[PDB]
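Dear colleagues,

For the upcoming journal club I promised to circulate an example of a predicted protein-ligand complex. I picked one with adenosine-5'-triphosphate because it came up in last month's discussion. The inputs are reproduced below in full, followed by the predicted structure.
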Amino acid sequence: MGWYVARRVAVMVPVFLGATLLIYGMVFLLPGDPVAALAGDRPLTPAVAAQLRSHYHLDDPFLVQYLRYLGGILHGDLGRAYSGLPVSAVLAHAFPVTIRLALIALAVEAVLGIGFGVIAGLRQGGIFDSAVLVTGLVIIAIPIFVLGFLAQFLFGVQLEIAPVTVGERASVGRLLLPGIVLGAMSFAYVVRLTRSAVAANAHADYVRTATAKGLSRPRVVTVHILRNSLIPVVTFLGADLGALMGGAIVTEGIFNIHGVGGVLYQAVTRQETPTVVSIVTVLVLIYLITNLLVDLLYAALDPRIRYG
Amino acid sequence: CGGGVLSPDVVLVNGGEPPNPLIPTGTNDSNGGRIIDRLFAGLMSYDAVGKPSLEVAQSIESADNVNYRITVKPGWKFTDGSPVTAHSFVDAWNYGALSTNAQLQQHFFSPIEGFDDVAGAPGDKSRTTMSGLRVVNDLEFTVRLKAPTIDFTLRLGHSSFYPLPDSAFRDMAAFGRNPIGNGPYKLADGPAGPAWEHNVRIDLVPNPDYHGNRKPRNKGLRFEFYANLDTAYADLLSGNLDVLDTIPPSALTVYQRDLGDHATSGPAAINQTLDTPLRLPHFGGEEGRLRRLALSAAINRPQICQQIFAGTRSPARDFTARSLPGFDPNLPGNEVLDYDPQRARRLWAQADAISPWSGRYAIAYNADAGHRDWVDAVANSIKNVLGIDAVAAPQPTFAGFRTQITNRAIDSAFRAGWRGAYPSMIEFLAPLFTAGAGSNDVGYINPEFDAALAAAEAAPTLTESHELVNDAQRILFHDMPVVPLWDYISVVGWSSQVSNVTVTWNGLPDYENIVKA
Amino acid sequence: HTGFWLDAWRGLRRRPKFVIAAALILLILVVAAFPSLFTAADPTYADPSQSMLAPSAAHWFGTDLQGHDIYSRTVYGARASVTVGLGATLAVFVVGGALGALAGFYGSWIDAVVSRVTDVFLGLPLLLAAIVLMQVMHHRTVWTVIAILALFGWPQVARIARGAVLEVRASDYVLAAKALGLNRFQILLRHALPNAVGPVIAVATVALGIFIVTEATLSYLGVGLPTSVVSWGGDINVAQTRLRSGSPILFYPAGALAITVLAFMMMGDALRDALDPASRAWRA
Amino acid sequence: AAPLLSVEGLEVTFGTDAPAVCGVDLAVRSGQTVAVVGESGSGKSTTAAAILGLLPAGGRITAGRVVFDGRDITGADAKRLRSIRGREIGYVPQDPMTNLNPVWKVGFQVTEALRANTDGRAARRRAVELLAEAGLPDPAKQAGRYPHQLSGGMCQRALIAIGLAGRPRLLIADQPTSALDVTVQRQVLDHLQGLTDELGTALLLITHDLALAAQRAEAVVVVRRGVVVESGAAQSILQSPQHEYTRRLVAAAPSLGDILVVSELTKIYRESRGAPWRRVESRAVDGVSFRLPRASTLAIVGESGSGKSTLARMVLGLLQPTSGTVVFDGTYDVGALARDQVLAFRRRVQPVFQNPYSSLDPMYSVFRAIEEPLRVHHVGDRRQRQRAVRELVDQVALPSSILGRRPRELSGGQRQRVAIARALALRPEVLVCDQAVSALDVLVQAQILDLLADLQADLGLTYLFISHDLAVIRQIADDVLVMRAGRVVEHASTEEVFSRPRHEYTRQLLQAIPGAP
Ligand SMILES: Nc1ncnc2c1ncn2[C@@H]1O[C@H](COP(=O)(O)OP(=O)(O)OP(=O)(O)O)[C@@H](O)[C@H]1O
Ligand SMILES: Nc1ncnc2c1ncn2[C@@H]1O[C@H](COP(=O)(O)OP(=O)(O)OP(=O)(O)O)[C@@H](O)[C@H]1O
């Protein structure tokens, strides 16, 4: 445990250094002069061709500019947006609504997936099991933005029962539909994985020798099945949340939601790279930290790998 | 909990790249005029309705409506600390009205009692000051016109009669990109390399050297240069803009549903009409007047206005536009232009007794800004209803489309809309329906009608002149050199924070008093 | 009686899921290979006369704004998407399988560095990394998209192959073989390629659909393929404005996009359930 | 009267395949011990699990009855069997590794086996009492260890403690000591037999060998293919077998120059057990030295974890020794094998590995695997390979229609026969049996031992046979070498091992065989 986390952390610092170096390399190494690509769309003038030189220090070796860039990122200075404002302020004012959307997405995902998965796994071979499997399969196929278009169309234009545009009025009643749209993709993975896990776990030997000693149905079921089957679910849940943070962009764009996903959508469709690379770096660090946390939690739940 | 799309604190409105140096008399387009109105202040100022009020001039008197004797208030200054004096106005007007300077808005200065001497021909242009503008003392001067013009006192607020600072009449080149103005606003000047950003944006801040009618009630504007207005509309929807000032045509059917009373509407001062020159065959004489009257009476204007524009247009009741200060909707005799195929067929029957028919009737039109819909619609509505075969005929270039009419009314009857300059119906009538007043692209000749206009301008009071121009307009119904179609109606959408927008008289919202909290 | 490559075919020959997926995949492959067979019209012909025509015998899939009937426009896009996916999947399979094998089989001082590398490349979500990298390119063609995709697609296949080979290495036939010759490389080939080539095939035939979806959603934003190549997700971008007005033009290209990915996913599902059922309980 | 558990006529089938347990019967006299015995796949566990309703997915009862004090529990009724399981009939599993939830702190899995309690005060200490009477070294300290931390010898004690929770009136221990090792099996069973009579429990135990079942239990019930063959007392059955099957079964019960000279062989493991600066070594094997005459059989016998498998590798060169000499035949040194010597040496020594299920490269045809050693050295062109294979497949029984098959479609003994044939492909001079006959039923065990004896008598090889017990050595080997703690404990001929042992370990190892004299 204590000597395990000492290894789980030390195996991570190189990951962080490598990822950040790769980011700061693909830009500032490949496209010859980086000022050619850092301009985006607006014309290049010596009036702007000098402010980014002082902010990025493109005159000295790769190492010093890299470390200076890291220092600026850590100290809470990410550049200046297209609208003359510092990016940090925009992020600080945009975290609430995206956090609120991710919360409902993850909630519906977890609860519906786990519920339907255990209900299917405890009674296999059933018509219900077949139906949930084929439904998860067909849902897996559709891309996120295609499903988002279908949803917004069918439920906002044909019959007006949900707002087709969530403009800055972020009541949860209006955020419900985008949350479901965002979370269904992961919910399919979850139900499939947990159904397989439970159906393969409800036959092991320790369950047999436990039910042999007169334990009540609910007690043996809950403990001896929904511990050993729920572990991998939370592992994959951490992983796929890390994967979905990036899928949130288009579902945040096609609904005009004034969050960080919408900010990034604007920045990429209008091609302002200096305000994109920073946001992506921050998101990657957040992903890495959450992976650290979920790995620690995993090891805390299963003692077998928790040996040292 | 919380949220927000936190935005800068000035204003983000739309606009474009003014394709001309920012000189008052050097621009003649709405895309480059909406910026120069905020940087200066003339002898008068129009409110949202279109009523004038003294701003810089101190006392204006006219004993005849000919010899105007104007006094300017002393306590003013430009944004470089230069005093505004009558010499500033005199030099501005003389420099604008001179042919060798070759400016755009020159024809404004026609009624200044000597304009021909300096704008006719280099025979006597040696004296380059019109014989009307004197100077009594540095705070007053004299103006003199050719004929009694009761309306001249109104147009003084136009962006052409604006003064220019004393240090600008020798360096018109750099002044053409960094102007200096007394207006309520003043170019932006923060981080070096600001102001005109060039095909990007323009920054404006309030001017602390202004006391007039138009004190700004917000922190400044930032005109965002755009194109493909649907882009700006999406940007607005994404919380990245404050005033759209135009709803793109692709979305004017759901803007209310998806914007929820953050969108207003208001009549403008822009009409649009198509015309057939009196030249091409089967269109002259009495039979030609009957041809035009029938073509007028065989158009389903309300149907088009409802179907295609879906309420951003409105059928015309007379040659002028909706909010013209003194416009009478139901002018007696309005029935001549309406949609009655009975009248249309009976009139074609009474008409083709001189000429049965020739052949095609095509419509030339610029085809890039987007006219196909209503062009084809009106073509179908005129064809197959009277037993004729009219069709469209696009020209992709606006340059060629304009050269065709500078070719002196050759062929292929075409469309032309006429924007307005200042709130007066006389400005909709005189420049287009006059023996030789420049743009008369059908060559309408009626000295009786021109005398009617002359007598109308020759009036002691203003309501009487209204009535006179109304009766003169009724006189036109007997000829209808051109056929009106409709006037413009704009729709403006503010986003979430600015709260006091109003469409004034031409579509442009009141940029001066839009409060952002 | 015969190699496992022959009895598995019979065991799968009677699978409705598999036969359906195979039929759909064959149809997609033939339409992507030979587009000009179905009709003869040209997709880049732009007639501004017809702009919002309805489905009919003349133009099946109506018409778009500038006049391009959606029918012919919805074929070469399939060609582009399918070639992207196939090339990326082949490359990623080769590289990931090779590296995972060489890592899992040898052990010290090699599997360590390989794990470090795949862990570094694992911290980057595919979509975000691709977005960031596609901002600095001016020569945007199909090949560069395949390259950037394969650059980040491998870590998963690498992990799978490493796990599989590390497991197979713990048998006794692999030991008895080296007990009589077969230096560490020929034995590796002959005995560890076949008995473990399954899981990599499964993860590859799923990552195929993954890459197709990623390419589509990336070309949708406008930082993907250029406008010169007709393609889904880019025929959708110009159709998102007219959707809010109540005209379902957008759903025809999306209808074709949501079918190839399905045909690949539900085929990878059958292959996985047939060749490696064990790892379903704690993976995927 | 009223003997417990009269189970006349169980007829379970598994998913419409076939009757897997045909008509059987037995009756426990409520105070006696009955041990049923049968070869693998005979249907002993199945009928032991079909009593408690613990049948796997496919199973189902089709006829017969199982009364308990007179009430049919055939009608599973999972509302009533709760009134029996744990209170009247216990259970003991077979696999001590995978029969404890591995994430639940076995001290806690036990604390609920007595679920009839107050749930919060008496449990945590009555459970320690139970483990104390179970016999573990220190119940208090081991009651807080996860099941993945304990050895095999304690897992079975914990399972027995769980079984004896509500002091059941009948126990169905199912092959308990099947995965345990000798000198632990005997002590566990001695503890069990003492723990039994104190309550009167019947202890229906399943096992698979005669000599043990007779010395332990009172009645025997032999079963073949799920059919009761016979029944009676232990002495009368073992001494007087009537049916041919039990006669064969008892007759197959095991109860009654120099080429290689290692020297001071030793090997250490630089183990890492946590803190990187805290690395402790684990000495595997050391101080070994002996001699092996030709045409003989010297065997190594040791307990689980005595360091015999590592010694076998280090003899086969597949493991780099730390110190010591393994010179072979006087020419081939094992320490530093020269370049040509690797392939000059691999063709005189060959191994035979432990289990038949995982040493055959499952994707290989039984011919393609046998030919592989004949191929790697490039001997036999294309068809003389078929010649050598057809001669080899007859040296072992292996009916010659077995060619072209796959390992997945073979039985147990045939796998070991194929392995031995392959090892015999290239004329080896010494074989090394790595616990070859360890996973097999008694009949194929004795059969392949006879086969090996014949092959030695026909080829002049020298076996290094390796085992984990001592019962299977007396009629084959001639030298013995006991190992424990990585060291040597005794080396002498078999007669001095069976008559006059010389070390207290050798004694309690001999007297631990199912002999019990
Ligand atoms: N779920 C099942 N499906 C099909 N057949 C089964 C199933 N469970 C058990 N069987 C059959 O029942 C038999 C089990 O009998 P038996 O008790 O001898 O097995 P075992 O416990 O492995 O043998 P041993 O006790 O010698 O180890 C097997 O031969 C197997 O073929
Ligand atoms: N990788 C290793 N690291 C540390 N010690 C090891 C390692 N492998 C083996 N050992 C030590 O040597 C012993 C031999 O290994 P193992 O237990 O697998 O086989 P064995 O005891 O020789 O054979 P058997 O399975 O017949 O008892 C282990 O019990 C352990 O004490």
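Two points we might discuss: Residues 4-280 of chain C form a domain with the MetI-like fold fold (CATH 1.10.3720.10). Residues 96 and 157 of chain C are 5 Å apart (CA to CA).

See you all on Thursday,
B. R.
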